[PDB]
Design a protein around this ligand. Structure first.
Ligand SMILES: C[S@@+](CC[C@H](N)C(=O)[O-])C[C@H]1O[C@@H](n2cnc3c(N)ncnc32)[C@H](O)[C@@H]1O
Ligand SMILES: [Ca+2]
Ligand SMILES: [Ca+2]
Lengths: 1013, 172
DNA sequence: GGTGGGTGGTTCTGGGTCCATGGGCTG
DNA sequence: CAGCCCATGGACCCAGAACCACCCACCC
DNA sequence: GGTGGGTGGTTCTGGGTCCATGGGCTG
DNA sequence: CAGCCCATGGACCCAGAACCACCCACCC
């Protein structure tokens, strides 16, 4: 402290005044006390005059040695007499072998630190701030042991897959013993009513492998073998392990596993601080699941909260507890509950915040937590108990940790009955008056692919309450409010029975998502103050948005956006502060370290009518100008009163759910993948009903919800030959597609736009809402995919009724309104179509009404000329409608031979690269390296500005012709045949033709008015 | 002082032999050095360590620490030994070399002897806080007879002022 | 003796998809 | 009521790309 | 600026006792 | 036959002293 340094400065003055001597022996007591008292606060002790054998066999005795609790030297000190040249005397001592690892040579007026044999800092002892800084460095030096410990923790992560092989084999050999099978069967039945209705042998053997692994490491690196003999859960699971893990069996697996545990054990024994050894606990937690059960890791959310975030929330919760409730976290009465402990970070950091005089009571009856997995439970219980022990000096058992599903223990019951004590702890916790629900809830909206068969568990009660509150108040077609984070937020609101704060770190979707509009209406009615801190970081984005989002505050390890929020319940004041754009993870995490909650300048947010908190449209426009389509205009039967939009029917592009099995560049190749699919499907419907219903089939084919339902209904499929149709997959990418209802999940209303895939209709395809990419519009004459443009919404010119004809889709309402504003009965439907297209390419319209376009269907103005705009839209339309029939812009082709004449260099030199040659200023030079041999050049800079989305039209024809590896195993090993060499000549022509299209539209769009209506 | 400071010393003696692994005097002395130093700060004295004094013989002798006043005048001394020696045997040799005896705490980590005016006034066990706090009270308050007589003359005035004020009132 | 490949290791760093799945129709 | 439509945002990871370290070859 | 001396630590080195307690005697 | 003589060799340890490191007084 500066206070400690200031007392040294006084002590020194008194020694030379009350004593009369400036001899080093008499004046050294002033610094001895400074070092000794600083150390007593840092967990070290300055032991004076301790002899150390120098490297030259000689013995050297420094004036003082900083020593740890394991009697290990962490620093040194040698005082000199001011009547000498410190620099000169430093050399003499260092030449006799005085240690140079972390030594403070100090005369009464000047201090020198030589950390790692190099002078880190030289200060004057008359300056308090300077000495305090130099002393801090000396007292916080990282010794080689802690760096070797860190290095070995990093090796353990990569050697975990190989340790788990030995432990798996042991548990596999255990199922050859009837005693194990018996105990295993009793356990599965007990945990099928305590943990999860579908607890299976796989879950049981994972728990056993976790017990044996944690057992070894807790006795060797953490020196707490007793933990298991005092842990209720550990004693129910040692019953299962005692059947096989004993004697020769244990001695064998131990001799093999010692080659992984050896290094970590060695380094860890020279480490005293548990705050350094808790980095191994985090590693075991995150790496066990990643190596053993990657699937179970996704459903549980096995990730660790960076300390900076945890610390910040604990401090910010204390701030709002004093502001709205006039209480502190240390005050008796504030019961804090962590619904998902994980590694126990939140509870261990609370122990380090709570004052020692008050910690005892809090640890005994006010700090509570819940876990679902066994490894997390054990790691948390040890972390919590050992952090308490380090701070207090005595070891007490934490009797407030429960292995229970937080979202199932709503019995405020057999949940938590793994052991008898665990059930008591669960029933006791459900009666405690909780004031603060701090934590980092698991997040998981949906499973990634249906083949994973790893859907989120169903929580009847919570799901039923979400339906009545969040879902019922949401005007969205798709509800993603059954995310595990949304389920943990509903629970928290209900768990807080009276008043308090729910402090959580979660996906930032709630702030801005069409689906969380119900949450944004219900949260303001159950909380009085909402304080959101958006740390951005959404890497599921692209283009300039990705750069703006920046790094993730979770050490850039997750891709979703992160927000630290505090919901207090004492109108509702919603406060919102966003971290700056274009920041990095370290910057965001250091901001959380430095900034305190009081300093943050939150912005008051006023919800609008659709409950949108962030991103509110400027209500100073004439935006009520027409409408391209409306849900009501499409659902209406007859009557112009209910037909109030330019177009009637609108649809989204075909989504297949199996793009790699239904889309191919060649007609014949598709037919073969489709034949294989139908082939293996027809063998799946022959399986026993039990296996059909339990989805127990080899997942070589991609079975979506629809196919799984048909298979379980034993409905056979067949190959219709006239279903392979052309489709615009991505901009300028015409891949062939199998348009069949059986193998395409959702065809939407596209059967009525392009009948049977092959029909005659021209559609203006736009982006959907909310568009995270810039607004995009493209005209297509072939069935578009849902992802040609973000959430592509197609607006057709005709509408084919069932057993009917192409009824003009441009409504008669629009026709008249246009022939009335412009007073011209010549205006036709095939002219408004083209007018709309040109307006949607108007650069000033897309700029002024941007926020509007991102949230609504694009309402169209009434531009003065009509004729001029309809003409532009016709030119524009033809360029994209016939982009394969334009005049190829002359593009110079330069060719180069392979480096050598080996067959394998030719192979590595006809592989696609398709890279746009850029400059050191990252600006297109006007050249594309197609493969290793050919390089096209001559592209104008103008063509790099027709950007459909975040990519130019030209970057689209390069991206969708690269040889990407199929993400399906079967497709990659049986149907991956595309080689750029075969299509090289085609892409060369396509590039030149699209270069023309782009350079034309940059001109046509540029000649449009500079202002919008 | 008293209990608070002595009890901190008892914990510090333990932390030194635990974190250092040495029960040698040169290392364990820091405990009693800081007791004597912090008590002195509060009593307007300072414990200046290793101050060389001269004996009648002319032999220069350096006690472990001397209790100096604000006018650089010694008023007490301290010598620490290890627990692995006989305190009483080291005491004759110390005083034979020419060690002072007017006010000296000879102390090993387990026993403390206060010698005042040349005679052992008190012998306490450092394990008993109240006992040590008693001996240290006599050490820090031992005064030479000069100040003992001045203090007595101040008390004489407390019963002489009435008689003196009569004369001044009669003059007024 | 520098000096540029040759070879292998050791840090950053940039940058971005199709598709699950409840709810609302609907006939 | 089951059988259609309609959404809507998603708890990473990895190929270059330096950039070193070391040292054979190549000039110098 | 060594030098001797004060103080405490750290190796070596040298140098050596009364007295238990079973067995045979023995009158 | 229970007292009464007769051997006979013993699983360390701790004070002098040397000398060493460090710093203070003391010459130089
Ligand atoms: C992000 S981790 C907890 C993170 C914790 N704050 C930390 O710092 O380690 C999410 C954890 O929630 C636990 N969990 C507890 N109850 C759960 C439940 N009902 N459903 C899902 N996960 C649950 C999982 O086992 C998982 O370890
Ligand atoms: Ca010194
Ligand atoms: Ca001493």
């Amino acid at each position: 402290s500066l206070q400690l340094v200031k007392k040294f400065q006084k002590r020194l003055e008194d020694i030379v005044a009350y004593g009369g001597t400036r001899n080093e022996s008499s004046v050294r007591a002033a610094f001895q006390q400074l070092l000794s008292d600083w150390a007593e606060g840092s967990g070290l002790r300055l032991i004076t005059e301790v002899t150390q054998k120098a490297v030259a066999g000689n013995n050297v005795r420094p004036d003082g040695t900083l020593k740890d609790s394991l009697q290990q030297s962490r620093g040194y000190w040698e005082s000199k007499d001011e009547a000498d040249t410190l620099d000169d005397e430093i050399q003499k001592k260092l030449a006799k072998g005085y240690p140079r690892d972390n030594i403070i040579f100090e005369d009464s007026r000047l201090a020198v630190l030589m950390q790692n044999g190099e002078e880190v800092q030289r200060v004057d002892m008359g300056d308090a701030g300077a000495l305090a800084g130099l002393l801090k460095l000396f007292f916080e030096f990282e010794p080689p042991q802690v760096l070797e410990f860190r290095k070995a923790v990093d090796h353990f992560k990569d050697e975990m897959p190989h340790l788990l092989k030995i432990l798996r084999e042991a548990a596999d050999a255990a199922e050859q013993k009837a005693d194990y099978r018996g105990e295993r069967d009793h356990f599965v039945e007990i945990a099928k009513e305590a943990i999860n209705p579908d607890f299976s042998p796989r879950d049981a053997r994972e728990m056993l492998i976790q017990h044996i692994l944690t057992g070894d490491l807790f006795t060797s690196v953490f020196d707490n073998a007793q933990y298991h003999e005092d842990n209720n859960i550990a004693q129910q699971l040692q019953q299962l392990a005692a059947t096989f893990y004993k004697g020769p069996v244990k001695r064998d697996i131990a001799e093999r596993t010692k080659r992984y545990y050896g290094a970590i054990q060695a380094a860890a024994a020279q480490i005293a601080d548990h705050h350094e050894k808790q980095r191994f606990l985090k590693a075991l937690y995150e790496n066990f699941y990643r190596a053993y059960n990657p699937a179970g890791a996704e459903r549980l959310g096995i990730f660790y909260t960076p300390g900076e975030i945890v610390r910040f929330m604990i401090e910010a919760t204390d701030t709002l507890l004093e502001k709205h409730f006039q209480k502190e976290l240390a005050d008796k009465g504030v019961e804090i509950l962590d619904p998902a402990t994980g590694t126990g970070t939140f509870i261990t950091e609370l122990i380090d915040f709570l004052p020692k005089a008050k910690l005892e009571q809090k640890y005994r009856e006010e700090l509570h937590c819940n876990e679902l997995a066994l490894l997390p439970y054990y790691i948390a219980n040890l972390n919590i108990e050992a952090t308490y022990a380090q701070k207090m000096g005595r070891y007490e058992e934490f009797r407030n940790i429960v292995l229970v599903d937080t979202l199932d223990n709503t019995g405020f019951g057999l949940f938590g009955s793994v052991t008898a004590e665990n059930l008591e702890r669960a029933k006791r916790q459900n009666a405690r008056p909780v004031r603060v629900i701090i934590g980092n809830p698991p997040y998981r909206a949906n499973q990634a692919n249906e083949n994973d068969n790893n859907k989120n568990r169903e929580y009847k009660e919570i799901d039923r309450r979400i339906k009545a509150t969040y879902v019922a108040a949401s005007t969205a077609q798709k509800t993603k409010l059954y995310d595990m984070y949304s389920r943990f937020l509903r629970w928290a609101t209900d768990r807080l029975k009276e008043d308090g704060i729910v402090a959580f770190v979660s996906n930032s979707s709630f702030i801005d998502s069409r689906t969380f509009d119900g949450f944004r209406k219900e949260v303001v009615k159950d909380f009085d103050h909402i304080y959101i801190l958006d740390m951005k970081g959404n890497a599921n984005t692209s283009g300039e948005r990705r750069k703006r989002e920046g790094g993730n505050v979770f050490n850039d390890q997750i891709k979703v956006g992160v927000a630290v929020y505090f919901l207090v319940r004492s109108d509702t004041k919603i406060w919102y502060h966003a971290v700056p754009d274009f920041w990095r993870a370290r910057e965001k995490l250091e901001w959380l370290k430095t900034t305190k909650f009081e300093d943050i300048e939150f912005d008051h947010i006023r919800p609008d009518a659709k409950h949108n908190w962030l991103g509110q449209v400027d209500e100073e426009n004439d935006w009520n100008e027409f409408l391209p389509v409306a849900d009501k205009d499409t659902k209406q039967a007859k009557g112009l009163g209910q037909e109030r939009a330019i177009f009637k029917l609108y649809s989204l592009g075909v989504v297949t759910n199996r793009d790699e099995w239904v889309y191919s560049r060649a007609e014949d190749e598709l037919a073969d993948k489709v034949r294989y699919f139908i082939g293996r499907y027809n063998e799946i419907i022959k399986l026993p009903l039990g296996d059909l219903m339990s989805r127990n089939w080899e997942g070589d084919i991609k079975m979506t919800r629809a196919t799984i339902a048909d298979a379980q209904s034993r409905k056979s499929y067949s190959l219709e030959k006239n279903s392979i149709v052309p489709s615009l997959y991505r901009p300028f990418d015409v891949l062939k597609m199998y348009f069949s209802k059986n193998l395409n999940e959702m065809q939407y209303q596209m059967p009525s736009i392009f009948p049977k895939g092959v029909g005659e209709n021209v559609v203006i395809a736009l982006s959907g809402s909310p568009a995270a990419k810039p607004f995009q519009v493209l005209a297509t004459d072939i069935l578009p995919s849902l992802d040609l443009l973000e959430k592509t919404q197609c607006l057709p010119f005709y509408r084919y009724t069932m057993n009917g004809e192409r009824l003009n889709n441009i409504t008669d309402y629009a026709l008249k309104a246009f022939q009335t504003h412009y007073a011209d009965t010549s205006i036709s439907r095939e002219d408004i179509f083209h007018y709309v297209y040109a307006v949607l390419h108007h650069p000033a319209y897309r700029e002024k009404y941007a926020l509007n376009l991102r949230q609504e269907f694009p309402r169209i103005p009434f531009y003065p000329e009509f004729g001029r705009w309809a003409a532009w839209g016709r030119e524009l339309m033809a360029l994209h409608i016939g982009f394969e029939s334009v005049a190829p812009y002359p593009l110079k082709r330069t060719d180069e031979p392979p480096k050598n004449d080996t067959p394998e260099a030719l192979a590595l030199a006809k592989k696609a690269r398709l890279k746009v040659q850029r400059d050191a200023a990252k600006q297109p030079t006007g050249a594309v390296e197609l493969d290793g041999l050919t390089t096209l050049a001559g592209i104008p800079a103008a063509a790099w500005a027709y950007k459909l989305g975040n990519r130019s039209a030209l970057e689209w024809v390069l991206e969708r012709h690269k040889e990407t590896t199929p993400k399906d195993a079967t497709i990659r090993e049986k149907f991956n045949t595309y080689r750029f060499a075969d299509h090289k000549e085609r892409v060369i022509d396509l590039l030149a033709r699209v270069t023309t299209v782009s350079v034309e539209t940059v001109r046509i769009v540029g000649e449009m008015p500079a202002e919008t209506m | 002082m008293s209990l608070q400071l002595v009890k901190k010393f008892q914990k510090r003696l333990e932390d030194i032999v635990a974190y250092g692994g040495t029960r040698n005097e040169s290392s364990v002395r820091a405990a009693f050095q800081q007791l004597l130093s912090d008590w002195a700060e509060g009593s307007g004295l300072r414990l200046i360590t290793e101050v060389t004094q001269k004996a009648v013989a002319g032999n220069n002798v350096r006690p472990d620490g001397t209790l100096k006043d604000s006018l650089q005048q010694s008023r007490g001394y301290w010598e620490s030994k290890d627990e692995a020696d006989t305190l009483d045997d080291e005491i004759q040799k110390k005083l034979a070399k020419g060690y002072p005896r007017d006010n000296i705490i000879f102390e090993d980590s387990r026993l403390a002897v206060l010698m005042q005016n040349g005679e052992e006034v008190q012998r306490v066990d450092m394990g008993d806080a109240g006992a040590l706090a008693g001996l240290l009270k006599l050490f820090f308050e031992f005064e030479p007879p000069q100040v003992l007589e001045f203090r007595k003359a101040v008390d004489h005035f407390k019963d002489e002022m009435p008689h003196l004020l009569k004369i001044l009132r009669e003059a007024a």
